[PDB]
């Protein structure tokens, strides 16, 4: 028995997608609901929009944009061309919003149902879709990210803790540079890191949730995963004790590093995917490594939460759309019997209402 389940949802090449467009710059998956692919067919640039609830009927529309990102929940699409940003409601055939920046946008992403984050060479902005909002600057970029390829941006649930991640080549390895910014303190901290997520976690005996910051890094010393509370604990709460654990890379994976993280708050577990397609599962509370295996030969270059299972969904370079999630019937007996860790097994069983710790 295995503590995780691995599923294929789609092969994009079966929908006529050119494998040259299956990559970070042309294929976006902002949630598990849609995949957008920018393609050129003859003379005309187009966007192919795959509705994951109706995947054999993609729509193709002409575009003149250098990037397209679908809203996480609705058929509302953001497109840009240099400094021009436009937002469309597809079913209304309507241009919702248009804005002209004074800098090119090198990376952008939906960070919520109604806010787009914009990263320029110099700063990070948030742009709300509510009312007549224009972009608001959140922070200036830290010099440690200068010249990096920006690969991710995320926030905590309350948008008070913000995290920008870039990568570059240094001493012949891919080095991660992160900028953590506190909205309330107006302070940044540079941190070496490859993939990260925030999470809400309520410790037993606390009345309020803790906001945790989790990141994984392959540093010069090796792989590490950190889980740390950000901010002052809510009044009355005990602080979450920080955790730090090794992230293992086998000897043949000397050039591998973390590329994606999703945290399930249903099960309080951390999914980590590496550049060369390894999947790890960690306990969010302790950092304990529950499971590692290999899910792809090809790099998985984009991921999202898989809402139905509280797992992770991703696309690889071949165009396989794959998800991983906790096997709810197996995880507890796996931890008890294979990991020989009845203490973690019993804690997780009661913490997340999972079967299997009736016998330890």
């Amino acid at each position: 028995i295995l503590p995780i389940r691995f599923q294929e949802h789609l092969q994009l090449q079966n929908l006529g997608i050119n494998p040259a467009n299956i990559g970070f710059s042309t294929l976006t998956m902002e949630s598990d609901k849609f995949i957008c692919i920018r393609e050129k067919v003859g003379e005309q640039a187009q966007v192919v929009i795959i509705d994951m609830n109706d995947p054999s009927n993609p729509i193709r529309r002409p575009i003149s944009a250098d990037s397209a990102i679908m809203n996480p929940a609705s058929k509302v699409i953001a497109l840009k061309a240099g400094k021009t940003l436009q937002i469309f409601n597809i079913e209304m055939k309507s241009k919702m919003k248009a804005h002209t920046m004074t800098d090119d946008v090198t990376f952008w992403k939906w960070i919520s149902l109604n806010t787009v984050a914009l990263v320029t060479d110099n700063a990070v902005y948030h742009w709300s879709m509510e009312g007549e909002s224009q972009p608001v600057k959140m922070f200036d970029r830290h010099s440690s990210l200068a010249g990096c390829q920006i690969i991710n941006y995320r926030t905590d649930a309350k948008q008070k803790w913000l995290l920008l991640t870039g990568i570059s080549a240094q001493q012949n390895r891919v080095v991660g540079a992160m900028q953590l910014y506190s909205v309330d303190r107006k302070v940044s901290q540079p941190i070496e890191g490859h993939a990260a997520s925030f999470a809400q976690f309520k410790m037993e005996g606390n009345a309020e949730e803790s906001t945790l910051f989790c990141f994984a890094v392959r540093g010069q010393a090796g792989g590490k995963l950190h889980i740390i509370e950000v901010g002052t604990p809510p009044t009355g709460n005990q602080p979450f004790p920080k955790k730090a654990v090794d992230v293992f890379f086998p000897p043949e994976a000397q050039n591998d590093f973390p590329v994606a993280m999703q945290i399930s708050e249903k099960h309080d577990v951390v999914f980590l995917i590496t550049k060369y397609g390894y999947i790890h599962l960690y306990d969010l509370e302790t950092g304990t490594c529950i499971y590692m295996n290999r899910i792809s030969g090809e790099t998985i270059f984009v991921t999202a939460p898989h809402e139905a299972t509280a797992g992770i969904i991703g696309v690889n370079r071949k165009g396989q759309v794959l998800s991983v999630c906790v096997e709810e019937e197996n995880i507890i007996p796996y931890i008890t019997n294979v990991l020989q860790n009845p203490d973690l097994a019993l804690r997780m069983a009661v913490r997340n209402n999972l079967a299997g710790a009736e016998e330890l």
């Binding site: 966007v47 529309r61 003149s64 944009a65 497109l79 597809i90 309507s94």
Partner: peptide, 7 residues
């Protein structure tokens, strides 16, 4: 300038 043609 219109970046998406929905017609």
């Amino acid at each position: 300038e219109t970046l998406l043609d929905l017609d």
